Each structure stands twice: as C-alpha cells, then as structure tokens.
Amino acid sequence: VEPYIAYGYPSLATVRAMVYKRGYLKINGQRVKITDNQMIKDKYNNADIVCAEDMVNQIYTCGKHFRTVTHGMWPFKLAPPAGGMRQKRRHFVEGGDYGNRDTLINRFLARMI
Amino acid sequence: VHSYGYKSGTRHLFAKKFRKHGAPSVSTILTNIKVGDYVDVVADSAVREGMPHKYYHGRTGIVWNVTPRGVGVIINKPVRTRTLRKRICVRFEHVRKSRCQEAFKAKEHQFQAYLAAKKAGKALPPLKKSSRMGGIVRPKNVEVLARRVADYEA
Amino acid sequence: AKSKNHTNHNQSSKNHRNGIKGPMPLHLHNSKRGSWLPALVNARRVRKHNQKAALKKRRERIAAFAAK
Amino acid sequence: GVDLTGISKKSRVIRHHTYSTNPYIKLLIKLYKFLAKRTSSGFNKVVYQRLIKSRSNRAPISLSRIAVVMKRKAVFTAKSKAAPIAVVVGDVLDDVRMARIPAMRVCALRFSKSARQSIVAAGGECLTFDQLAMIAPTGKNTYLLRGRKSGRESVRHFGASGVPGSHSKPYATNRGKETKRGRRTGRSYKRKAFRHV
Amino acid sequence: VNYPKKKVMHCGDARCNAHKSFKVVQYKAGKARLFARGKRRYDRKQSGYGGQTKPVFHKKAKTTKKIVLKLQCSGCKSIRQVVLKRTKHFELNDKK
RNA sequence: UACUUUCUCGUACUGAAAGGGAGAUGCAAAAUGCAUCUGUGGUGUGCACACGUCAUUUGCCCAACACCG
RNA sequence: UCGAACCACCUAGUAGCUGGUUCACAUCGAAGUUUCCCUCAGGAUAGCUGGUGCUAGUAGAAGUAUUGUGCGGUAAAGCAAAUGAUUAGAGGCAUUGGGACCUAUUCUCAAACUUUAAAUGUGCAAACAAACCGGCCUUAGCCAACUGCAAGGCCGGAAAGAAAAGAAUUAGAGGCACCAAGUGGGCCUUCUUCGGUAAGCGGAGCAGGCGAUGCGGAAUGAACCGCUUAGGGAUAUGUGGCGUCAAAACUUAUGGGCUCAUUCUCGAUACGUAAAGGGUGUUGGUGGAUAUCCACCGGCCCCGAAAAUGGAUGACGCU
RNA sequence: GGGCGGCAUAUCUGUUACACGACAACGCAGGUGUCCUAAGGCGAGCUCAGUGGGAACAGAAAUCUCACGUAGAACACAAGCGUAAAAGCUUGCUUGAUUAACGAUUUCCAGUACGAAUCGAGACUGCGAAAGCAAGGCCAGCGAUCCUUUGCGAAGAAUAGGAAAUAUGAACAAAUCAUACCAGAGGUGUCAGAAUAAUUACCACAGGGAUAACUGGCUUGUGGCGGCCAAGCGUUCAUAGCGACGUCGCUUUUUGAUCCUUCGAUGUCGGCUCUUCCUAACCUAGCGCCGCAGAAGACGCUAAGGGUUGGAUUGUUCACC
RNA sequence: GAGUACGACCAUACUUGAGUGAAAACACCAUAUCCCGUCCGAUUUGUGAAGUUAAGCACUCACAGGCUCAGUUAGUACUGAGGUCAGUGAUGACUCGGGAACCCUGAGUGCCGUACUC
Ligand SMILES: *O[C@H]1[C@H](O)[C@@H](N)[C@@H](O[C@H]2[C@H](O[C@@H]3O[C@H](CO)[C@@H](O[C@H]4O[C@@H](CN)[C@@H](O)[C@H](O)[C@H]4N)[C@H]3O)[C@@H](O)[C@H](N)C[C@@H]2N)O[C@@H]1CO
Ligand SMILES: NC[C@@H]1O[C@H](O[C@H]2[C@@H](O)[C@H](O[C@@H]3[C@@H](O)[C@H](N)C[C@H](N)[C@H]3O[C@H]3O[C@H](CO)[C@@H](O)[C@H](O)[C@H]3N)O[C@@H]2CO)[C@H](N)[C@@H](O)[C@@H]1O
Ligand SMILES: [Mg+2]
Ligand SMILES: [Mg+2]
Ligand SMILES: [Mg+2]
C-alpha cells in the first residue's frame, strides 16, 4: 500500500508528541482524550501501563505490550503538514512523498502534530 | 471454451509430466486413507477412471467416505456469496495424503518434547537470538562499488 | 437489435458486499448418509449401546444423589 | 472522509420499546427496565428484554413442559432447598395429556383458565411479575423458560419445497392438487428428499 | 446391430433366481384400442364443429427409434423388457 | 346494543386405492412379550438460575441447532 | 364518411408500447449480471437492496500478510531437445537419380508446438464441540488371531491457550431466519486482449469509476487530477498555480544552462487527436588523425508543413 | 438495420483464455443425431509404426528370417489426454450391454430438471490358478406433463387380511371391460418441449433515433495530392523533365465502414439565382531554372487582388464534341 | 566382501564398446517317458546334472552420448504496484518489490528394506 502511505522510523519526541497532544483512547467504545494517568490506568488494567510514559515506553521500545497499548489508542488524526507536501503521487526517492523515510519521517510529522 | 463437457480445457492439465508417464505406483496402493484425514485431490491420468472434475485438482480437503476403491472428500467451492462444501468421490489414485498440517504436528510434538524436559529434567536447547540486533562488523574484505567505465561495454 | 452479451464486471464487487460466506465447520451437518454401508450399519449397533449406557449412567447418577 | 464501507452492515435491529398497546405490559416494562439497570442480575436483563418482544416471539409454554424440566432439575436438587419458581414471559397453556403434576410455583404473563386450575389443584401457585418482583426481586432460585417456536405452521412453510433437501409445506388450499410432477419419480422427476449440507 | 436370438440372464422370479436362457422377439407397439379412456375423451372433444381440437405433431426430427427387446424366459414364460440405443437397422440372428 | 344454537379450522398423519394409524423406561427377545406411569428417546453446542474457584470449574439445561435412534 | 357506410351498443375492448402520477424531513441505498422462457422493448430466477427480527456481545470473523504444504504451463526461453515451419554453407562416397540420401552445425519462427519455466495468482493447516497422552465398555467392522486395526462413547492426565527465531494485524459481535422492492438497454478508463486498414468501431478479462454526485483543479469537457459531500467559523493543505484578466514571486533569488521563429503569424498546463527525411543555424558529446581537418551522436531552432465565416498556448502579451 | 445467406437455436475436442476455476464475438480450426453380439466382459500369449541386412520365380513394393526400434502404430469416429509382459494385436471362453432395495455425489447450475459421468450396497453371474476385473464400447451421440402402448403383480395355500393374498368401478356379487399404482417405449432438432403459407405501390395502429435511407461526426481501407531512397529513361549522363522496387505521409470535393445525434418530421437530386471563402495557380503581376538560340513551352517560387464564357445531346453531377 | 528370492523410490540405475569375475548361487546347458503346449521341446511345460563362464548377471573402465546436481548466463529476459514520467508515436527508463530459461562449465554415474546363503 505504499502509494497511499508515508512511513518511516520515529524518534522519542515523535512518540511523546503524538501521545500527549493527539493521543486519545478507546474507553467504553468511545474516543476520549488522554487527560490524566488515572484514566490510562483505568483503561489498560495491566499494572505495568499506569501512566502516559508507560505508553510512550511500549511504543518506542516494543516491550511485551506494544499491541495492547496501540490497540488501546484510537488511530491518531493529524493535521496536514504546514509548509506543504512536495508531490503526493511519487515516491520519496523520485522527488515526492510516499514510501519509507529512514528517520526523515520525524520532520514531516513535526509539521503535523 | 466452445464446449462445456466434462474434460474441457484439460489439455495440459490432465497430462503427465515429461518422462513421468506410466501406471500408478505400488506405494499409492499401499498408502491407506482413513476417514477424517486431509487428502489432496490430484487427478491422475493413466487411470482415467474415477477422476475428479478439473476444478478439484489443486484442492485439498477432509475424507468423509472410504469405500473399497473410493475416497469421498469434502472440498470447499465458492459459488456466488458463499463457500459450500462439495462432497466429491474419486478413485483412490486421485488422492495424495496432505502435508498441510505437517508444521503443526511438528510444533505440537515439540510441546511434548518441552514439558518433558521442564517438569522432570532441566536440559533444554537454547532459545535462538535474533539476527536483527545491532552488532559490530569486523570487515574481513572491503571493495569499492563504483560503476567502472568498462561496465557499459556489454 | 444487438446488445451486450456477457459480462462479469460488477459481480465480484456484488459478491463481497454480504461477503463470501466462508465454509462451515466439520461438526455441523456431518451426515454419514451415503457413506460406505457395512461400516454405517456397524456404527448403528454401537450407538444403540451408547444410548442405553447413557440411560444407565444417568440413572446411576441419581442413586448416587439420593443416598448422599 | 472516512472509509466506512461495511459499517452499516454491522448494525442490528434492537427496538428498545414495545409495540403492544396493553397498559399492563407497559407497567411491567416500567418495572423491569428499572430492575435491569439498578441490579447486576442477568435475570432482570433477560426478563426485561424478553418482555419487549413481540407476541410471535413470546411463544407460549405448556404445563406438561414445565412439569418435566422442573422434574429433571429437582432430580439433582438436594431436597432441603424447595424448588425454583418457574417463570415464563408468555402464556402457560394446560396440557390434557398430563393429569397429575407436582406443586410448582409458576409466574407467567398470562395463564389459561384451565392451566390456572390444574396448577392450584396440584397444590401449586400461579404468580405474576409484580408478585415476582417482591419474592426474589433479582431472580434468585428461579427457572426461566420460553416455549416452542418450531412446530408452527408458518415455520413449516418456510422454504422453497421443490429444491433438494427441503421438506417444507407448499402454500396450497387444495391438498390433492400439488402432488404429481416433481413430487413423484414416475412423473419425470421427484425432488431429492436429502441433500448434503 | 446384430443381436442374438438367445440371451442368458437372471429371470429373478423365485422359480428361477438363476441365469437361464431367454428368447428375444422385439417390441412393436400394440394397436391403439378404441374405448381407451383418453380415446373416448378425444372422440367426445372432436365431435361438433370446432375442427381439430388437440395439436397434431408434424415436425418430426428423429430418423431413428430406441430398440426395446422383450425377453421371455425358458423356465417361466415371463417377459422382461430391456432397452438398447438408437440404431437405424436392427436384426436378430443366430449367425456369428 | 344485549342474549342463544350445529358448521368450519385445528388437536394425526399416510397410501393410487382397498386400508391402516405414532409415549417413555425396565425385564427382555414372544409372527398384538410382560411389568411399571412423577415424565426431557439419546449425544455435542446452548440464556437464566444453584453450589465452589479466579481476576469461570461443575449441575440442570429453557428456546434453538447439528448428529442419531 | 369507403381496400368494407353511418348510428347506438358489447366497450372504461385489449396494450410486454408511449405519456402522466399531487406534502415535508429523517434513517439506509442499488442494478444493467446468472439461469430458463416462440425468449431478444417482457417476464420468472439467483444476486445486489430495505424492513422485521431472532440468537449465549468477540463465538463458526477477514477482497491482508507471515510460516508450512499442495496446484498450474501464461510471459520469457528453446529450435544447437520431440512435433510444425524455415534459410544456408560444410562433406560422408558410393546411398542415388535428372539435392536427393546421411552426419554434425547454422539463419529464422510458432494462438491451436514444447524440455524448462516466472511475476501475479490459487487450495489447505496454524490448540477451547478440536487435536495430544494412558487404562476401560461396546461392535453380526478388518485381520489367522488379538494385545493390532476401524468406529462410537467412557475415565484419568497434560495444556509456552500457543515459546524463542522479524513470528501478524484488525473503526474484528459470530451464527440463523422471514418479508419484499427497484434493476435485468449500461457506459468510460490504466492494464491484458479478439475481430478490423481504421474508428469517438465491435467483443471480452482484472479492478476502479460515471450512471446515482456535487466540490476544488486541467480556460471549456458525464468518465481525467485532487477530493469524496449535515449548518457554519479559524488554521493548514491537496491537485493546480504566483505578468495582467485572477487570489498569490508589488515581474522572487544575492540559481545554472539552452533558444530567435517574416502573413493560421517560435514556444508554452499530462490524459488530449503529424512522419520519413534534410540544415555550413546554434549548443554540448564521442572516436580518429596533421591550431586546422574527418567520421558519428544528442539538445533547442528552422525546412519538410496545402483548404474552404474572422480566430485563437483561454485572452492580452512575453524574447 | 431488416431481407436473402447462414447457425453462432441442443451439443463435443483444440485455441481465443491472460500458468486455479470462470470469460465474449455470423472469432479461429474441426466434430455431433450415428456405429458395434463384438468393435462389450475377461484370461492367456504377443509387440506396434518404421528402417537395415539377407532368401527360387520375386522388382521400390508379394512372403520367410534376423537385428534395431519410448510408441514415431493402434484404440469405429472430430480433437485432446492416456496406454507396451498394455488400454494395442491375436486367441480362448463368455453375456456385467441384465438386475441394481427411490443410497450418495459430480459436471451444467437457480446449486432446478435433463444428458453424461463417478463412489457404493443387494441379487445372479462371466473370465481367471489366484488377487482381481466386469453392471457397455471412459470422456459428445439426446428429450417433460397429457395421451397412446407394453411388461411385471404364475397357481397353490390361509377360518382369516396378519410376517404373508396388488387395488377400484362407492346398494351388493360373479364374469368381461375400463382404470389405478410401478418400470419402459412411441416426441417434441425452435432440442426446459404452440398444431402454422404468402401478399400489400390500397394500406393501418402502437411505438423506436434501442434501428436503416439525406446532411453532420469519427475513421480514411478506397478515391484524390505529395515527399524520401535512386534501379532505370533522357545519344553522353540518376534528378532539365521523369522515375520502378520500396517507403513516409497529407487530403476529406469520392466511396466503404460505423451507428453518436434526429422517426410527437432538420422538406432527400440537378439546374436557375446570388454572395462569400479556400489554394493544391488555368489567365493576368514579378520571378528563378531547362536536354531555354529565337518562337512556342516543361518544372518551380511569392501571390487567391481580379477574371474564369456562348452552345448541341442528356433530368443529369459527369461525359462528349 | 558378495549371491539369490521379494522389493520401495524408478537413468546418479539408461545406451554403446571394451575389461575382469574367489567361493557359493544364479545362469546358459542335457533331454522328451509321463503333465502340458506348439508349424517347430524355438518359446513353453516336464525330467535332469555331463559341460562352460562364451553369453546373461555382477563389477570396473571411456576429454563416450544421456541422466543427475550445483555454478554461470544474470539481477539479464520477464513481471506485481507508481507517476500531470520521457518520447509525434512505437516504446523506453526510473521508483518500490519478486526474479527466469537454454547454451556453457564443474562434479559423479544408483540408493535404502526384508528373508536365506557364501
Ligand atoms: O438471515 C440471514 C441474513 O438475512 C443475512 N443478512 C446474513 O447474515 C449475515 C450478516 O449480515 C447481516 O444481516 C443483517 C440483517 O439480516 C444485515 O445487516 C444489515 O441489513 C440491512 C437490511 N437487512 C440494513 O438494514 C443494515 O445495513 C443492516 N441491518 C447484514 O449485515 C453478516 O453481518 C454476518 N457477517 C454474516 C451473516 N451470515 O445471513 C443470514 C443467514 O440466513
Ligand atoms: N433430543 C433431545 C431433546 O430434543 C427436544 O426437541 C426434540 C423435539 O421436541 C423436537 O421435535 C419437534 C416437535 O416438538 C415439534 N412439535 C415439531 C417439530 N417439527 C419437531 O422437530 C423435530 O421433528 C421433525 C420430525 O421430522 C424433524 O424433521 C426435525 O428436524 C426436528 N427438529 O426436536 C427434537 C426431536 O429430536 C428438545 N430440544 C430438548 O427437550 C432436548 O434437547
Ligand atoms: Mg396438521
Ligand atoms: Mg468525483
Ligand atoms: Mg396419442
């Protein structure tokens, strides 16, 4: 599905900006925003994931509960990037935007979060 | 294909492989098929008797019937919006036993190999480390990838 | 006059709206009618013993309740 | 902007209110919608949801059916406990074919005039759902029953009746009319009484 | 298609229940009798003024009819009808 | 409006017709076997409820489905 | 009033054909395909669709991967391997008659040829009605027999609920049923493809679209590009743009080259509707030779290049 | 478009068909309505097509013998598969080409019927020492209700309709007769199945641009007009003027092909009249070039400003004087 | 280290031409009264035991043909996804992946099972 997606390798600040600013949770089948770590601890019920730094831990360093944290959250809905996109219709190597960025995806997401 | 008979478009399909001709072998007769077993219907011309239809040639399903020279086998055929289960009946040369569950009976018997070394003894084969970790590279040979001029003259 | 003969265009998109309904499991509708008959008549002899064993086991489970 | 393709097909039909015009069913729906939310009992969940259901989906039970399944539970009941209160959301009819029955305590949505008599003549008791909300208000020591929906005429007509496997009944006011072609092997074919799956 | 005038077959009649000699005649249809039920109905429908009242088939396409052999057993003289395929010429002869 | 009586549909189907006509269990094997009459024909899956356990084990299984008798 | 008068009637004859069919909002939302039909402007049928639900809310889930294990003969390859074609030289010398024949090679091919053989696909399995491990009961199943085999139960055991090796993921409630609409003229497109000289032609395959749907862009365009649509704001984008029309480089750079064209007037937004050939116009390259020649190759520009209302990179214009 | 022609109307192998399966066209290449008492069934023995060496008459070919021979033969037939102590050939005995309790299934598919086929169980058998194989010749070769018609339901038992005797003609009974239930047959090739000749220019109705004749559109085979290459023509010589074999194209004043628009109507030829446009220039204005001495003229360039007739015949465009 | 009988995979086992072969066994070989079958005691059937490893069989050897297996061909041909890519077009490259085939070259030239025997 490469013509439809732009992927890459996140940093620690890309994870914690996405979890804090635009990270929400699937609580009672509803999309509620992370406001306190009590609401995270009430969601996962794992005694290893009790705060918002537990979720950026399991995401950034995979851990035993990468799936339960990411299936815990709603899909992140970002803004379009400020400053634009170069070409949607071509790969990143061809001079456009889709495909893999071997850690360059951080500056592209830093214009969206 | 201008005709809709039973063997139509089966020119290359019901043929035999090059220097693989002949009547079926004795290890096909001795291979005993049991009800409830996954078999693998592959139509064997040089028998020409009790062949499956051309649809059931790569297919593999469960035996439900064993008669003296016949095997019934339940094979899924998707029709419009549903996958109904066709119970065909072939001669016994047109089935092979299926090795589909070979990799599952292998890690099942590895789970009685383990649990027979944990509860009683202690001797285990070690767990395998991933090759995707970050090691150091000791270069025993280096080249230069450079696209020489003489690479074009061919 | 002449029209369009045969097409398979929309059909695969029509077939997946209510899904391709998958096959059903092997414990549903596993009728042995039409199977090889000497082994079918044998298995009836056995099920008529397994039913009267089930009538006797449940009756024996009641006397192990009225005494305890 | 969301790619929600098969998302209306995941929806189901629930119908939280009743279609009935009876003012006494609406009082039980006033009572059991209260108990369904204000109690952790799964009894009041099921008794509220089965009370909403239509009159076709509240198929009635027979008194000889209550007398057999209460027998097969009182077989493995310790005899220090009494017996459950049989509760059906629907009608109890009498059964001619079962003369003597034990003293059972039945809560139904309506009884016959004769099913009421044969319960109380056996030493039993016909209850009602306002009276079941007082003794066992959460359904402790009850036995919830339904009543049979197969065996109906309409269910016996559901099907094609001329494709193989189908033994449904044709819609025919004349019984000896649709009995010839496609129903006897001598009259060019007869639909196959059995088909696998 | 040559066919023998004798044929050894099963007879299934509990006086036989065994392979016995049959003899072969051929099936030729009997004369359509008046005072059959559908013939009396047809004579009642035709009488009057409407003309011809049932369809009368013209467009014959078969040039050939199926062969039915009546097989009378030697033991118990009981006919058994069997059918053979469509052939244009059929003959019974003992010559081989 | 109030009130009162055979006819019809249904409780039993099947066969072309003459016709025949469906409970369970136990003993048991009699070309109408005998005795009981508080009873799901049996097995798999299966709301509620009854007794334990953990952060479901089991009993009965209602409605239902499948496989049989 | 005549190739069958006029009047009343039967008669509001019948029409698979044409025309019409009267309020609002909301929730969902298609089909031009299958099979049969004196059927091809129509139906019945399955499908897509709505309504009603029912059943124990993750269950018997999947237009997807991964690992294991099967199926294939299309693209390519080959003719130095069979069959079908098809050029040409080499001599074998007795195997012959006015290249036959043989042996090794060769030039060139195959929708109805093939040794081999992809990519894309396609089947099954991947632990909760299940398989796994040690007795028992039953069977007029199998075998000489049972202690073996096959079958259906019963009893007890174990159970990373599936390890580690990249070792899945899911806006993943599963399974049933009733009732019934509209449709059954399609059309366009990337790719594969058939008939045709061709076609805005005819017919197919996989998918996506229009039909039925606007909106933002390509000046204009059912179908292209972007995006998909409750009533409104703010910010930021996408496709496409930034000399004026016309929002934006008040004609941006403190970037590089190339280009000159004199009566449908160089050129210039894809889809989208001029070639062979030529040039001592200019600007780069390559290989040879003695500051000058020679053979080649590319970029832009010119020639090749002729139609019927006045005319069109959208207009002005731009060098 | 319809008509003629045809069959793509029921159906079979190869290909189209895009390595599961499924896929269209009056797409390509051929078949089908029959044939067989053996050309079925089975057992035994054998090896085929062809070539090579040999043997009176006897040759390329008659028949004997030997060798090699993966099938190059054969299997009734179209084709494809398959096959060598065989599936072929010869021989020997045979009738499994019968019956087959309404078993189940596949292909076509609506998961209906039909046709064909597969895996069974039961009776009686055939061949074989046996294991086995055989209920046609694999795979195409065929057909509803209604009606006609045939076969089976031997007689002989039964104090009684049953475990066992086919049944009815309805107030009874006998004997005829008809009927019923079961399995076939006689047929519908338009092959899921009405019993069917034209004509209409005297014509009609409901419709259709789902569909033809006129224009327009697309295409440009065909018809008009060129360029490129240069074998040749021109006494000499490629090009003054031409230019085969090829080749690349322009043109929409022809015609074909299509079926987009119009069938609740776009008045369907040619003259006559009148105006304008285009250039691929016949005359006129400038020219270049010649196999251009002059005179006439060939070829070409810039140019469409202006001019481009009177008649005989023909309805004519055209043609022809 | 071999034989024989039954064998499983079915050429790494085949084809051609040489070479060698202890024992024992296979095998040619001898024969025609019975059993049996032929134009023919050839095959086949019976009954044998004088002879020979000539041949079969076995093994070994060929700049043998074949077969088998890697390698090369070759990241080549081809192909899945992409573009308001390039080119009048034919078609080509690029980008994210998958990835052949013959020729050619090297290797070696059967392997496993049961019973009986030397
Ligand atoms: O009974 C059958 C059922 O009718 C049929 N749909 C299917 O069930 C599927 C199931 O499909 C859903 O069934 C729902 C209704 O039956 C339907 O939901 C949608 O239906 C429309 C109207 N009926 C809409 O109004 C609405 O969008 C929505 N309710 C289907 O989504 C699937 O969800 C399951 N995955 C599989 C079932 N097989 O099959 C039944 C079997 O008889
Ligand atoms: N067999 C176990 C028991 O079956 C019961 O149900 C049994 C019967 O009550 C029930 O029979 C019903 C009958 O009640 C009702 N009046 C009519 C209905 N058609 C029958 O149903 C059954 O009978 C017909 C007979 O042909 C079958 O075709 C059908 O498949 C089957 N569902 O079906 C089962 C017969 O095998 C209950 N589910 C329960 O008490 C218990 O599980
Ligand atoms: Mg009834
Ligand atoms: Mg759109
Ligand atoms: Mg008749």
Task: Map chain A to HEC letters.
Answer: CHHHCEEECCCHHHHHHHHHCCCEEEECCEEEECCCHHHHHHHHCCCCCCCHHHHHHHHHCCCCCHHHHHCCECCCCCCCCCCCCCCCCCECCCCCCEEEECCCHHHHHCCCC
Residue type, C44: R
Experimental method: cryo-EM
**Ligand having the closest approach to the CA of E39:** 5
Are D94 and D183 spatial neighbours (Cβ–Cβ below 8 Å)?
no
Indicate the pairing of strand B95-97 with strand B38-41: antiparallel
Helix D42-52, helix D25-37: angle, nearest 10 = 150
CA of E1 to the centre of ligand 5 (A): 29
Which residue numbers come right before each break in chain C (C to N over 2.5 Å)?
none
Calpha distance B62→B40 (Å, rounded): 9
Which residue of chain B comes nearest to D196, CA vs CA? B87
Name the minimum distance, in Å, from the CA of C43 to any CA of chain B: 14
Decide if C38 touches B, using CB distance below 8 A.
Answer: no
The CA-based angle A99-A104-A106, given to 5 degrees, is 110
Name the minimum distance, in Å, from the CA of B80 to any CA of chain C: 6
Q: Which tokens belong to D187? A: 């009259």
Are E6 and E21 spatial neighbours (Cβ–Cβ below 8 Å)?
yes
Q: Which residues sit opposite A45 in a β-bridge? A: none
CA of D171 to the centre of ligand 3 (A): 13
Decide if D197 touches C, using CB distance below 8 A.
Answer: yes
Calpha distance E93→E96 (Å, rounded): 8
- Residue D91 neighbours by CB under 8 Å, 6+ apart: D58, D60, D61, D108, D109, D110, D111, D112, D147
Helix/strand/coil for E20? strand
Q: Which nucleotide is closest to the Cα of E37 by its C1'?
A: H178
Tallying the residues shown for chain E, one arrives at: 96
Q: Ligand 2, atom 40: nearest CA belongs to which residue?
A: D69
Helix/strand/coil for C45? helix
Judged by CB atoms within 8 Å, which residues 19-78 of B form the interface with D? none
- Subunits with 3+ Cβ pairs within 8 Å of B are C, D
Are D44 and D136 spatial neighbours (Cβ–Cβ below 8 Å)?
no
Provide residues of C within 8 Å CB-CB of chain D.
Answer: 17-18, 24, 29, 31, 33-34, 62, 65
Q: D5 in ligand 1 pocket by Cβ < 6 Å?
A: no
CA–centroid distance for B143 within its chain: 43
User: From residue C12, how far is each of B80, C16, D7, D30, D158 by CA, in Å?
Assistant: 8, 7, 19, 49, 29
Residue type, D83: A
Strand G at less than 7 A from CB of B147: no
Name the minimum distance, in Å, from the CA of D165 to any CA of chain B: 15
Are D97 and D79 spatial neighbours (Cβ–Cβ below 8 Å)?
no
How does DSSP assign D40-96, residue by residue? --HHHHHHHHHHHS-STTS--EEHHHHHHHTHHHHSSS-SSS--PEEEEEEEEEP-T
Q: C21 in ligand 1 pocket by Cβ < 6 Å?
A: yes
Q: Which residues sit opposite B97 in a β-bridge? A: B39
Q: Report CB contact under 8 Å: D196, C62.
A: no
Hey, CA dihedral for E21, E26, E29, E31, is it positive or negative? negative
Q: Tokens 């050894």 appear where?
A: E8
Most ligand 1 atoms within 8 A of CB, residue of D7, D9, D15 to mutate: D9
Are E80 and E9 spatial neighbours (Cβ–Cβ below 8 Å)?
yes
Decide if C20 touches B, using CB distance below 8 A.
Answer: yes
Closest CB to D194 among C17, C33, C65: C33
Q: Which tokens belong to E84? A: 């053979």
Helix/strand/coil for B107? helix
CA of D153 to the centre of ligand 3 (A): 8
Calpha distance E82→E70 (Å, rounded): 7
Calpha distance D12→D194 (Å, rounded): 33
Decide if D81 touches C, using CB distance below 8 A.
Answer: no
Calpha distance A99→A1 (Å, rounded): 9
| Residue D106: Cβ-neighbour burial (10 angstroms; 0-12, 13-18, 19+) | buried
Strand G at less than 7 A from CB of A5: no
End-to-end CA distance of chain A: 23
CA of D148 to the centre of ligand 2 (A): 10
Q: Which residues sit opposite A31 in a β-bridge? A: A26
